[PDB]
């Protein structure tokens, strides 16, 4: 024992194992014990994931401590050596696994039937050996240990289907609770359970990762399983089972993919946020190995607090730079919490139902939501309504023939410098769950190219998406629209209309799918608007591009002794107290905003005959009026078939805001009012 000394460590693992078993058996304060019920669910093949909440463990410890029984800080020990406790917990699950209440049908998946076969074979082996030893004629209490020693069966790891994950202790309980930036993940935290907060940039495709590879040796009829615990491994040549290694028979062994064990694997990559980066540095990234059923829970551009185990890996760089046992580090994901919930993930659960109806009962949800976005901005309310309509979005129509209507709004915010267009765009970026704040020129040139590159993890030549693809089903928030290269405007044409990007350059011959709603802020030609020039000559947008904008605000700056002092008082209040001036007003919290908007999105209102008759009359009068003064100094181009379609989209989204599931005349009247007042600031 000279080579390997020993240490007196405060932790004990058998007592902790017994505590773990007790907690699993007898935790029910959250129809019987919660985790026993979950295990029963898993036995019936209904569930393939087991989430052990550390909050439950803390509550169990605390309740056992009040009654008098001393309980070791199992939660602290998990927070210190989480990797070993995963094995402890899976062994405990195997020791308490309930019997299935429904047997194996033909609808069940292959892994379940293979595991059932393995369990039946293990039981048959054990019973056969027990029968043989009983017939040898030498009580089952003694016989069971002997049979277990003399038997060769399927190990528990290869007979379990559930995946096991932890959940960090919540911050409201008062180290896993505190979210840490990537820079603060030093070498001290290795092996613990930590929560890293940051943006997700790159997510690989789901590929099968080998846990244990199964070989078949038909000469001796044995299945041999080689565990794999690295990026690479080596196959076998001689059957290492007892007979082929012992007898003169040398059995050839072959791999079996179906019999082997795999796991869904994804090498994500989280990145530091702008708030966490210190002064003068640039964000750095940390690799995440998402494994098991947790795959596809992370997408690029997400802002998440991934909780996982900070495990080391052997050094993978150049050998010359190596000086000692250098270790590369990663984070094995356990639990993922999204800062901004996705719109496509909305379920009207009773609690979401109550927060939502409380918003409904507030009355005037449309105006309250409109004034809610960016409260620090004063007096720009029609633009806020338009942006809310942009967030809600119309209804996509795909007729049986194949025609597809956009169903999304494309808003522009042309106006003078210093009217808080960029701050409106940044606010919308805050409320919106997905959206890129693309701005300026040059940077956009490669942010829409979407070219092809090889992924390091799988060696796949995955295409890289630009800003617009990353903003799929989001808001593109393009800033400084007028100062941006014409080459990208050519792509913006097709993105706005067809919702897809067609690329036919060298190496790429595909058509990207980019369903996006574009918000554009820009200055007119010659900077400040000149009233002497016609609006079309001063907006500078070509008639094709301008047609795609459902609403094009003017936001002209016209000084006045009253509005100027109103704005000045508002801004000075915002500076002197970090809050909107309005005492009686209640700015809705952004989470409630997102929730209501998400509920609204599910509704898909349709049209009524009176509504479409009114819309047709409006379109006729708009077309004739546009034709009349198309050559005047107050012209706004010529109305196009899209202009009605925009009216349709705004009316449908307004109906979605009332959740009316059917459009009324008032919605159309408000939509026409918005479209008309979008141009009334130039008088």
């Amino acid at each position: 024992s000279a080579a390997l000394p020993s240490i007196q460590l405060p932790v004990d693992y058998n007592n902790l194992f017994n505590e773990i078993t007790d907690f699993l058996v007898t935790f029910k304060q959250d129809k019987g014990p919660k985790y026993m019920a979950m295990l029963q669910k898993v036995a019936n093949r209904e569930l393939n994931s087991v989430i052990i909440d550390l909050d439950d463990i803390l509550q169990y410890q605390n309740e056992k401590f009040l009654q008098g029984t001393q309980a070791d800080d199992l939660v602290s020990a998990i927070q210190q050596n989480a990797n070993h406790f995963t094995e402890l917990f899976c062994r405990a699950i195997d020791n308490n696994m309930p019997l299935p209440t429904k047997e194996i049908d033909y609808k069940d998946d292959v892994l379940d039937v293979i595991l059932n076969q393995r369990r039946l074979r293990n039981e048959r082996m054990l019973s056969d050996r027990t029968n043989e030893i009983r017939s040898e004629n030498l009580m089952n209490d003694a016989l069971r240990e002997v049979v277990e020693d003399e038997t060769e069966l399927f190990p528990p790891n290869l007979t379990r289907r559930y995946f096991l994950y932890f959940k960090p202790l919540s911050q409201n309980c008062a180290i896993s609770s505190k979210p840490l930036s990537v820079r603060q993940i030093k070498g001290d935290f290795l092996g613990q359970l930590i929560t890293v907060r940051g943006i997700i940039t790159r997510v690989s495709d789901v590929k099968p990762a080998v846990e244990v590879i199964a070989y078949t040796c038909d000469q001796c009829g044995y299945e041999v399983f080689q565990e794999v615990n690295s990026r690479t491994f080596t196959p076998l040549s001689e059957c290492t089972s007892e007979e082929c290694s012992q007898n003169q028979t040398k059995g050839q062994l072959f791999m079996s993919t179906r019999a082997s064990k795999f796991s869904a694997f994804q090498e994500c990559k989280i990145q530091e946020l702008s708030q966490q980066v210190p002064v003068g540095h640039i964000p750095r990234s940390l690799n995440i190995h998402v494994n098991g059923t947790l795959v596809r829970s992370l997408s690029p551009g997400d802002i998440v607090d991934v909780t996982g185990i900070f495990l080391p890996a052997p050094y993978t760089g150049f050998k010359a730079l190596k000086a000692g046992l250098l270790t590369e580090t990663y984070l094995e994901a356990q639990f993922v919490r999204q800062h901004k919930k996705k719109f496509a993930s909305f379920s009207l659960t009773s609690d979401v139902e109550e927060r939502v109806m409380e918003l409904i009962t507030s009355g005037d949800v449309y105006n309250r939501l409109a004034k809610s976005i960016a409260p620090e901005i004063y007096g720009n309310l029609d633009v806020k309504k338009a942006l809310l309509l942009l967030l809600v979005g119309g209804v996509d129509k795909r007729v049986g023939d194949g025609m597809k209507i956009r169903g999304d709004i494309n808003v522009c915010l042309m106006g003078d410098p210093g009217v808080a267009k960029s701050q409106l765009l940044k606010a919308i970026c805050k409320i919106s769950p997905r959206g890129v704040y693309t701005t300026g020129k040059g940077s956009s040139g490669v942010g829409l190219t979407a070219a092809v590159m090889k992924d390091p993890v799988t060696d796949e030549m995955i295409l890289e998406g630009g800003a617009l693809v990353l903003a799929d089903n989001g808001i593109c928030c393009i800033d400084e629209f007028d100062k941006m290269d014409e080459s990208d405007r050519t792509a913006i044409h097709e993105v706005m209309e067809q919702q897809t990007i067609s690329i036919s350059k060298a190496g790429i011959n595909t058509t990207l799918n980019a369903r996006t709603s574009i918000l554009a802020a820009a200055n007119p030609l010659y900077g400040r608007y000149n009233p002497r020039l016609s609006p079309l000559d001063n907006i500078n947008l070509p008639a094709a591009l301008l047609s795609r904008f459902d609403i094009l605000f003017l936001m002209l700056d016209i000084p006045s002794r009253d509005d100027d002092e109103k704005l000045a008082e508002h801004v000075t209040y915002v500076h002197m107290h970090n809050k909107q001036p309005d005492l009686d007003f209640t700015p809705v919290e952004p989470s409630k905003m997102r929730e209501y908007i998400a509920y609204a999105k599910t509704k898909r209102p349709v049209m009524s005959e009176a509504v479409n008759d009114y819309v047709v009359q409006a379109y006729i009068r708009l077309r004739q009026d546009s034709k009349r003064e198309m050559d005047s100094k107050f012209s706004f181009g010529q109305a196009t078939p899209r202009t009605l379609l925009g009216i349709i989209r705004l009316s449908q989204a307004l109906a979605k805001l009332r959740l009316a599931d059917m459009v009324d005349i008032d919605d159309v009247e408000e939509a026409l009012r918005l479209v008309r007042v979008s141009k009334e600031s130039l008088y």
Binding site: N83, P417, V436
Partner: protein
């Protein structure tokens, strides 16, 4: 096996430590701070100490020379002595390590002069960091658990770069199984991992031989010294110049050489990312507090910015307010309100605009100097480098000038495309990449000052200012103060200028002779006698020394966080409304940015007066500055 000479050196160093009680006091401070932070939670400050090599040379020439020229044999005894002193001192229930500062004599080198005849010696190399390997932890001790026996086993690990002495090379294999043969499971979180970072120091371009390829040396930083600096900094890395490897002598061209890091000193140089902090003694803070009481404090400070330059007092006041800056405001919804003020100078040639820019570069804590087109739009902001080792991000000028100043010169010569990319940095104080699959928002909270001659060479009174400036209206809006200066031929003013210039040129530095040429000083300040200056080119105010002004700015920026008051708010609102609704052909367009800059200038003046609140006088002074900038009114 114990060694007698080792113990003798240990005793000598303990005697040295007892002689200079400053180090003992510093160790006590470290330990009490760590204990207090432990008690507060029922930043741990690292186990390190700084040794003044001058003090050691005074105490014992033999020991000082031994550390300097034979560090592998002298440093470990001193470290053990320090560890024993810490253990004895720590009456309250990981060895300590040394760090060295002082004059290294002939061993103060640069990566060009680092020849083999300095090997195995303590050296102090200075240069610019160019590469920083990402911090990869190193495994020094691995704890394993044996399931069968239920006991924990450990093994210690080491390599050549860990130990200054050459410990006997023993292979370090990982304990897969126990002595009895039982399976062993690794116990992370109980194993001890230590950080490790390789940084490369290149000779500074300020003193590199022009036109020749550079020379680089690798530095291995471990533990507390990791992540101490970033690429593009200036460092003074003192450490043992170790030589490693077999040198190819073993049957497989030279020996691999590197510097084991003992101390890293980020060095402040003009137009570099390293900020220039200064030590504030209680005497200095007392002087600052006393001087802040005067009513003419703003004038006194403003006069001291550019004593050489005659006049331009309003410009100097604006520059001082820029150096103080405003308070940036962050709200719950996520909106960020600019708290930095930008100044643009437009005027005739030889109006001392470039001189003011150079002084701002020379006096701010963190300033970056750029020219018109030498720093392109890629040079400013930031852009992806597409490095093959992949798609790294390189911070341009403005990102490196976070919480600092950017001194752009010849703003008019800038490309239109270059000035397109500057809008977001000016207003939103962020740089968005959104390029090549990289979506990032770097933080660039920089204050921009620019000088640019009018398009017609000399400002044209006959033409309107819109024709002369030729800058986009948005860019002019983003600039808080747009000063339009001129070279006007006036007898009295010009003869006063001549008097001042001839007075300035007739200056003899105190430690100099008449015909003695002035020797250039690099002045690489390290990021860590009276207040008033007797010499004055302009005569009778009291002018403060530039280092004292730097101390004043450093104190005011950190200590004071002013807040607005209703009294100041009324004045600001009245001034804003009067400016917006009165037409007097102002030089700049008047928008809500004018209100914002009124607020920020009032806040800056409040910071100058060291006031916790913004008062009426600050609002009046800010309005006066703005009116001087636009109308030209001066009272």
């Amino acid at each position: 096996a114990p060694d007698a000479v080792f113990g003798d050196r240990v005793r000598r160093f303990q005697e040295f430590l007892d002689t200079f009680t400053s180090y003992r006091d510093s160790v006590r401070s470290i330990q009490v701070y760590n204990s207090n932070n432990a008690a507060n939670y029922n930043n741990i400050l690292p186990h390190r100490i700084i040794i003044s090599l001058d003090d050691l040379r005074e105490f014992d020439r033999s020991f000082w020379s031994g550390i300097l020229v034979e560090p592998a044999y002298f440093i470990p005894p001193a470290e053990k002595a320090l560890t024993d002193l810490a253990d004895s001192m720590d009456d309250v229930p990981h060895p300590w390590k040394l760090s060295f500062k002082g004059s290294f004599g002939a061993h103060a080198l640069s990566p060009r002069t680092l020849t083999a005849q300095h090997l195995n010696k303590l050296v102090s190399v200075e240069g610019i960091v160019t590469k920083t390997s990402l911090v990869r932890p190193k495994l020094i001790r691995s704890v394993h658990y044996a399931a069968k026996t239920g006991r924990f086993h450990y093994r210690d690990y080491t390599d050549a770069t860990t130990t200054l002495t050459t410990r006997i090379p023993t292979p370090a294999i990982y304990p897969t199984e126990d002595t009895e043969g039982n399976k062993l499971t690794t116990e992370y979180g109980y194993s001890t991992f230590i950080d490790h970072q390789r940084i490369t120091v290149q000779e500074m371009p300020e003193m590199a031989p022009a036109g020749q390829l550079p020379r680089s040396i690798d530095v291995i930083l471990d533990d507390d010294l990791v992540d101490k600096t970033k690429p593009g900094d200036r460092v003074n890395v003192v450490g043992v110049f170790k030589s490693l490897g077999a040198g190819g002598m073993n049957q497989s061209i030279g020996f691999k050489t590197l510097i084991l890091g003992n101390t890293v000193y980020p060095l402040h140089a003009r137009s570099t990312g390293v900020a220039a902090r200064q030590m504030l003694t209680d005497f200095d803070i007392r002087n600052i507090n006393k001087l802040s009481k005067k009513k003419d404090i703003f004038d006194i400070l403003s006069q001291s910015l550019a004593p050489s330059i005659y006049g331009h007092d309003h410009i100097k006041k604006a520059i001082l307010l820029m150096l103080m800056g405003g308070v940036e405001k962050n709200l719950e919804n996520g909106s960020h309100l600019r708290g930095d003020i930008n100044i643009l100078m437009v005027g005739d040639p030889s109006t001392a605009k470039s001189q003011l820019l150079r002084f701002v570069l020379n006096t701010a804590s963190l300033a970056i100097a750029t020219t018109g087109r030498g720093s392109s739009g890629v040079g400013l902001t930031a852009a992806v480098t597409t490095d093959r080792e992949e798609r790294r991000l390189e911070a341009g000028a403005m990102v490196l000038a976070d919480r600092g100043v950017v001194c752009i010169d010849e703003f008019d010569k800038m490309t239109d495309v270059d000035r397109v990319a500057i809008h977001e940095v000016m207003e939103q104080q962020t740089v968005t990449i959104a390029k090549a699959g990289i979506h990032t928002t770097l933080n660039a909270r920089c204050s921009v000052i620019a000088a640019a001659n009018p398009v017609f060479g000399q400002y044209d009174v006959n033409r309107d200012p819109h024709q002369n400036i030729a800058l986009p209206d948005s860019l002019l809006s983003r600039f808080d103060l747009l000063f339009v200066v001129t070279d006007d031929i006036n007898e009295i003013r010009d003869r006063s200028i001549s008097e001042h210039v001839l007075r300035t040129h007739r200056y003899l530095p105190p430690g100099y002779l008449e015909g003695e040429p002035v020797r250039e000083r690099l002045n690489l300040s390290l990021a860590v006698d009276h207040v008033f200056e007797k010499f004055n080119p302009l005569l009778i105010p009291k002018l403060v020394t530039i280092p004292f002004l730097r101390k004043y700015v450093q104190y005011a920026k950190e200590r004071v966080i002013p807040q607005l008051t209703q009294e100041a708010i009324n004045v600001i609102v009245k001034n804003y409304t009067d400016l917006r609704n009165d037409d007097n052909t102002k030089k700049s367009p008047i928008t809500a940015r004018t209100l914002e800059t009124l607020i920020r200038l009032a806040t800056a003046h409040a910071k100058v007066r060291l006031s916790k609140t913004v008062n009426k006088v600050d609002a009046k002074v800010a309005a006066n500055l703005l009116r001087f900038a636009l109308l030209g009114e001066d009272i």
